[PDB]
Amino acid sequence: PLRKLAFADLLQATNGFHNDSLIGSGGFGDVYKAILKDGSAVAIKKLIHVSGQGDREFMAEMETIGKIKHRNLVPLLGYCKVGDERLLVYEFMKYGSLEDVLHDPGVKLNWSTRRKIAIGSARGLAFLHHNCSPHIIHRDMKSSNVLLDENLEARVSDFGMARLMSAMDTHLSVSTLAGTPGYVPPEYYQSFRCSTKGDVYSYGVVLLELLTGKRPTDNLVGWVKQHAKLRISDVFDPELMKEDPALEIELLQHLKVAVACLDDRAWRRPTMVQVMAMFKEIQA
């Protein structure tokens, strides 16, 4: 069940929102690591800009991730909405974000693990797009929003910009442009519309990060697309090919999936269900 947590609890569990428990801040607000009075290990997000972006993002998460549970989505355990304070409480994910692991410090992700992360994150997204009615459009898929639990299982997070779309529709007309530089679907720049195929594109970028080990802003999408006609054995993460040269065939197949996801035309991109089926076909 989703719990309504007393504000005093979150206050003392973070030692009065002390800098020492701060594990991230910016844009949306802060994220704190804590142990609740019952021993639960949690991440506590403190949203800022409550008079505007703050409340909207709070409501977006409550209306989406707050209403569903799935093995590849971060669990929202609780919330606190007192006065103009907006806090969201999640199960703590041991190894933080995929971006932290890939672009900082740390912990090594071999190809086997990265493949599981790719599959897991794809499954979470597929659940949003196909199993949920109304469908959920995440709108901010990226490596910092793929969390890794104690088993290095991928769990999709940050539904602050997520929206509900009727299953009878192919797109949703919105008020603003949502997303992150390096991940925005090209058609999002041209129209105030979002779609599940938009999430597919952004997922494609993440899959590229797993294959290359590079940041999207290095864009990466364009850099990989041009080398796809040059030398393919140049874009892959060196630490992946050093493991086993035999993995090259499997890497290129996953690369094909990423390229398909990253098509400029939304209508040509696969659904996340097609992506899963493709992953399954590669393993077999």
Residue numbers belonging to the annotated binding site for ATP: 23-31, 45, 91-93, 97-100, 140-145, 158
In this structure, are residues 182 and 205 in contact, taking their beta carbons and an 8 Å threshold? yes
> Residues 79, 177: one domain?
no
140 counts as catalytic: yes
> Residues 266, 140: one domain?
yes
95: exposed, middle or buried (C-beta count within 10 Å: 0-12, 13-18, 19+)?
A: middle
> Residues 88, 102: one domain?
no
> Residues 102, 79: one domain?
no
Residue numbers belonging to the annotated binding site: 23-31, 45, 91-93, 97-100, 140-145, 158
> Residues 70, 107: one domain?
no
> Residues 44, 11: one domain?
yes
Domain final residue pick, 92, 127, 153:
92
In this structure, are residues 29 and 35 in contact, taking their beta carbons and an 8 Å threshold? no
Residue span of the structural domain in which 272 resides: 93-284
Angle between helices 196-212 and 248-261 (to 10 degrees): 150
In this structure, are residues 196 and 271 in contact, taking their beta carbons and an 8 Å threshold? yes
**Distance between CA atoms of 34 and 14, rounded to whole angstroms?**
6
SS3 137: strand
Prior bond to 134 cis, omega within 30?
Answer: yes
**Å resolution of this model?**
2.0
- Across the chain, where does the E strand assignment appear? 3-4, 22-26, 29-35, 41-47, 76-82, 85-91, 135-137, 146-148, 154-156, 163-165, 172-173, 193-194
> Residues 8, 135: one domain?
no
Catalytic residue among 38, 84, 140, 264: 140
